[PDB]
Each structure stands twice: as structure tokens, then as C-alpha cells.
């Protein structure tokens, strides 16, 4: 014959079925590690955030009036009780239409609607450093099998 090998074999394959994605392992997210006080500031010196974080007032009762206050403390004590505050807030809360009141960044929209704080550090991840190189390599390549005379 030709010697088509089996044939058999590379049908096995052919049964093969895409199977959907997993979810891994979602549950939180260090965003102290990437919000810095410049940019949690303008946003949780915002009235409509304070109110929300009346039920949850940092330790010593006196929370950050303005975005001075958080710029200063930078990662001490109250910015890390405010941080935690903060994301609680939102998660249970959910800010939602109220970051929009303010024109507040969409990124924080999306995750404060869903009260996600994964897609919050994901969004401000990809927003401050985002990711571009490109190495495809491809094409053009081809193989010329046939070409062989001369």
C-alpha cells in the first residue's frame, strides 16, 4: 500500500473534548502590596466611602478625614486597618453606584460592585504595569518538503 501507519492511532485523539476552566483557589488578595496610599487616598477621603466605613471605623475611632492623613501614615497601623476596613466594606456593602458618584477610576466600580477585591487588585495591577512584550515567532517558516532537486 502507502503505509498510512495504523490510522487508528491519530483517530484515538480525535475524541478528545474541551473541558471548561478552574477556578483555582479565589478568596483574597494582599492589596497593600500594590494600592499605595496615593492611590487609596483620593478614594477613601471621599464621604460616600466614610459613611460606609462608620460601621467599621478603624482602631482608635478617629478614621483618616483626609487623603494628607493616609498619605502620611503610608503603611502603618491606620492604613492597614483602613486597607482591611476598607475591602470588607465593599465586599459585604458593595459600594457600586456610589465610587460613579464621585468619578471615581472603573476599575474600582467593577470590583466594588461585586465586592470582589481579587478583580480590584487585578484591574489596578494590570491599570498601573501592563503587560507587553509579544514573542509569537511564527510564520514563514513553512518546510519545502518536496524541494529537494536540483
Known amino acids: 500500500g502507502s503505509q498510512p501507519i495504523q490510522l487508528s492511532d491519530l483517530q484515538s485523539i480525535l475524541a478528545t473534548m474541551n473541558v471548561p476552566a478552574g477556578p483555582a483557589g479565589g478568596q483574597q488578595v494582599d492589596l497593600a502590596s500594590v494600592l499605595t496610599p496615593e492611590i487609596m487616598a483620593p478614594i477613601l477621603a471621599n464621604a460616600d466611602v466614610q459613611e460606609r466605613l462608620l ?17 502620611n501614615t503610608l503603611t502603618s497601623p491606620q492604613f492597614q486597618q483602613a486597607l482591611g476596613m476598607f475591602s470588607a466594606a465593599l465586599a459585604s456593602g458593595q ?3 456610589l465610587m460613579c458618584q464621585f468619578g471615581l477610576p472603573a476599575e474600582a466600580v467593577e470590583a466594588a460592585n461585586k465586592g470582589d477585591v481579587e478583580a480590584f ?30
Do not use: C, R, V
Not at 55 to 71: F, K, R, V
Not at 122 to 142: H, I, V
Open 95 to 97: 459600594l457600586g453606584p
Open 55 to 71: 460601621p467599621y471605623l478603624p482602631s482608635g475611632e478617629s478614621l483618616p478625614q483626609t487623603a494628607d492623613e493616609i498619605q
Open 121 to 150: 487588585a487585578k484591574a489596578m495591577q494590570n491599570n498601573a504595569k501592563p503587560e507587553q512584550k509579544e514573542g509569537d515567532t511564527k510564520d514563514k517558516k513553512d518546510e519545502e518538503e518536496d524541494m529537494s532537486l536540483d
